[PDB]
Amino acid sequence: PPLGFAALEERTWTVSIGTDGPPVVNARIVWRLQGEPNLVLVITGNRIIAWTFAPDWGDSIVE
Amino acid sequence: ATEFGTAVNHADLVERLVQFLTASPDLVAAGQAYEKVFDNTIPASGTAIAVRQVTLRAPGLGGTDAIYMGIQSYGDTALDYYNLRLMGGTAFNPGAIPPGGDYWTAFANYSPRVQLLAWNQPMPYWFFANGRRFWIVVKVSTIYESAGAGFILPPCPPSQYPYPLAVVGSYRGDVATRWSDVSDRHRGISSPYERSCYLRDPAGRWLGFTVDGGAANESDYNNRTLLPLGCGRYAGSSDTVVKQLRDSFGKFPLKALQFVTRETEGRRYLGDFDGAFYVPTLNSGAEDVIVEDGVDHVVFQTAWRSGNPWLYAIRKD
Amino acid sequence: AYFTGTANNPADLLAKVRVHAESLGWVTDRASASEWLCHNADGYWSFNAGANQFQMAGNTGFDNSLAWNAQPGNSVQNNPYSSKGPTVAQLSGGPFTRYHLFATAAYLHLHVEIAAGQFRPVMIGSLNKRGVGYTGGQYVCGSFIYTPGQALTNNWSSHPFDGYHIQYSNSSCMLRLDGLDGGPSPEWLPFDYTTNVPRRVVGPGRGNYSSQYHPDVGLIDASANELNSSTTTVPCAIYAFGAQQRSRYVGEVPDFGICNMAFLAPGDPLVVGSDTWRVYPLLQRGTATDFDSTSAWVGYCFRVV
């Protein structure tokens, strides 16, 4: 996290979101710096797993 | 960052300019000096003064930017003008110059040239410079000239618009003019007219800005102007607040200069001049030093006249 | 700081805003169900609540035995207008959908939604001196409607900080500038432009009207950027004309700005940095060129803290 920013320099990080975690994404990342009020980056969402099994259909599927 | 003094001649003026840009204590200490990428004298002077061509690179305050600028010293003794032509670009390549011709075409996305008017004589000069922009003001001694170029300060991320390059001059560089000209087109940075200021659109297309309309100028640039001095677009009278501006109880207000375009496709606010402001003329004038928050600003007036709407101040830091 | 609520009648709004001011420490010299004489460290003011409108007037001294519009150094008698009328804010009668109140120690800003799409702003405070040495700076503004049904934003209409209006009786907003051109200290300058009075003030009030007199009208028009959909605020510069039509910049409206609502819905948030801003329409949502029946797309920007 400790990172010196050069003047007139933009540093674009790569926010990689994984596939493992709680089903509810309740995150509050804080970008705290001296002489500046806290600028918290809040990430919210949900984690889900998809059903990737092809079911046999010799018997009719009932909806 | 400031170089005040008197230059014995135009060539000495350019020499002092380059020496200041390359050896100023502030520039060298902060490592913001510009790099001279080209310097040549191609033409064979006949009945004219030697022509000096220089191209310089500016890295910006952060050192991550790429700014390319050019300066030309074109003069004619038989007409006794020693114009200094300025232009900007993004890339340079000496090999791309076609046989003969000129090198300014080699610039990628080249732009029309502007210039400042002077001649061979002792001349007081006022110099300002910074890692992103430079300003030149030459006092003709009972006339004042000015020009400059650099990066404006837009309100959008530089990640998406990293090249807000602007070039401004007192008169268009496409023609040769005598500094004693009597045309309204000779004016300053606050009020460009008839190809006196160019800004580079984020799309990469250079757009000209004029405070007043002109039949000779292209129709496209009419919609885009400088609002502070272009209040006549919305006001329904010739006389407005701007022309009648005055200091308040011995205090001189400073008004910034805005870059705005009103196009049919859409509107967009581009940025502001860095270090240039509009100030009134009353009880004041040229060579006036106005302080602000411990910051001093110099006052200057356009060559055309020295009235209220043709007067501006420049920050000296 | 930021407050919201509902009021069936104006008197409820009076009670709620006075309660908030008292809780914030504002000093009320005299209080009543419908008449107020309050003050702070900056200036004195008086307000009266009518059946369907407010009556506001500046003040310089206090006298409990005088009427609401007869306080020492009152605007009614110390103004160039021959009508001698105080500030007026016209509202409707009955339900107010919602009111948004911004409260501080130096100024009060209010925005009331009388009905769906109808908004009535009430502005009071003192201009940021910005290091400028001048006595006064207190400004009180109101909202006036010409005629329902017909064009709501006619030329005769007046708006807060308006720079162009036609009316001989009442003024929407006003400003104090003491000792102008050697005159007596009590001076309550109104926002007028067609009266040719030697001393007057002007503002960007109407926003981007065709005949609006202010050099920043272009800035308000171009506040919105098409390329990146970014919006920038514009401080509301106020200008005062001297005895011989010589303007002197006076100040800016604290914690206030204007922009275009072309690409923003009412209340849409655009947090630019550590400080957040709230944008609401002036009168009602309309189209770009609807300068007669609505307020076009002019939006008022308030800093929320």
Which amino acid type is present at position C302?
F
Using a CB–CB cutoff of 8 Å, tell me whether B153 touches chain A.
no
Residue type, position B222, single letter: N
Check CB contact of B204 with chain C, cutoff 8 Å: no
Residues of B in contact with A7 (CB under 8 A): 61-62
How far away is chain C from the Cα of B33, in angstroms, using its nearest Cα?
32
Nearest Cα neighbor of B115 from B82, B163, B68, B150 is B82
Q: How many helices (H) and strands (E) does chain A have?
A: 0, 2
Long-range contacts of C33-37 (CB under 8 A, 24+ apart): C35/C68, C37/C62, C37/C64, C37/C68, C37/C71
Residues B248, B249, B250, B251: what is their CA dihedral angle, to the nearest 10 degrees?
A: -40
Contact B132, B58 (CB under 8 A): yes
Using the Cβ of C218 and the Cβ atoms of chain B, whether some distance falls under 8 Å is answered with: yes
For residue B220, give the 3-state DSSP assignment.
helix
- Decide if B62 touches A, using CB distance below 8 A: yes
- Of residues C83, C94, C239, the one with CA closest to residue C169: C83
Report yes or no: B295 at the C interface, CB cutoff 8 Å: no
B10 SS3 class:
helix
- With beta carbons under 8 A apart, name residues in chain C contacting A39: 274
Name every chain B residue with its beta carbon within 8 A of the beta carbon of C219.
227, 258, 260, 269
CA of residue B116 relative to chain centroid, distance: 9
| B291 residue type, one letter | V
Q: Is C223 on the interface with B (CB under 8 A)?
A: yes
Q: What is the 3-state secondary structure (H, E, C) of chain C?
A: CEEEEEECCHHHHHHHHHHHHHHCCCEEEECCCCEEEEECCCCEEEEEECCCEEEEEEECCCCCCCCCCCCCCCCCCCCCCCCCCCEEEECCCCCEEEEEEEECCCCEEEEEEEECCEEEEEEEEECECCCCCCCEEEEEECCCCCCCCCCCCCCCCCCCCCCCCCCCCCECEEEEECCHHHCCCCCEEEECCCCCCCCEEECCCCCCCCCCCCCCHHHHHCCECCCCCCECCECCEEEEECCCCCEEEEEECCCEEEEECCCCCCCCCCCCCCCEEEEEECCCCCCCCCCCCCCCCEEEEEEEC
The verdict on a CB contact (< 8 Å) between B249 and C226 is no
Q: Does A20 touch chain B (CB under 8 A)?
A: no
Tell me the backbone φ, ψ of residue A18, rounded to 5 degrees.
Answer: -80, 180
Interface test mutation site (partner B, options A5, A8, A9, max chain B beta carbons within 10 A): A8
User: Could you write out the three-class secondary structure of B22-83?
Assistant: HHCHHHHHHCCCCEEEEEECCCCCCCCCCCEEEEEEECCCCCCCCEEEEEEECCECCCCECC
Q: Sort out which chain B residues have CB atoms less than 8 A from C202's CB and list them.
A: 241
Distance (Å, rounded) from C-alpha C214 to C-alpha C208?
A: 9
- CA distances (Å), origin C3, targets C6, C107, C108, C272, C281: 11, 14, 11, 21, 18
Residue B279 and residue B311 in contact, taking contact as beta carbons nearer than 8 Å: yes
The experimental technique behind this entry is: cryo-EM
CA A41 to centroid of chain Cα atoms: 11
Q: Is B95 helix (H, G, I), strand (E, B) or coil?
A: helix
Which of B192, B172, B186, B164 shows the shortest CA–CA distance to B274? B164
For residue B10, give every residue at least 6 positions away whose Cβ sits within 8 Å of its Cβ, in sequence order, or none: B49, B73, B75, B82, B84, B118, B119, B120, B123
Cβ burial of C285 (10 Å; 0-12, 13-18, 19+) is: middle
Q: What are the strands of the beta sheet with C276-281, ordered from one edge?
A: C256-260, C298-304, C276-281
Q: How far is CA B290 from the centre of its chain?
A: 21
Cα(B181)–Cα(C160) distance, integer angstroms: 48
All residues at 6 or more sequence positions from B99 whose CB lies less than 8 Å from its CB, including other chains: none
What are the C-alpha distances in Å from B1 to residues B4, B18, B189, C56?
10, 13, 20, 53
User: Of the candidates B211, B165, B223, which has an alpha carbon nearest to the alpha carbon of residue C222?
Assistant: B223
Minimal Cα distance from A36: which residue of C?
C274
CA gap C237, B256 in Å, rounded:
13
Q: Which two tokens stand for residue B256?
A: 């910034």
Angstrom resolution of this structure: 4.5
Q: CA of C176: how far to CAs of B306, C274, C275, in Å?
A: 33, 33, 30
Contact C225 B240 (CB under 8 A): no
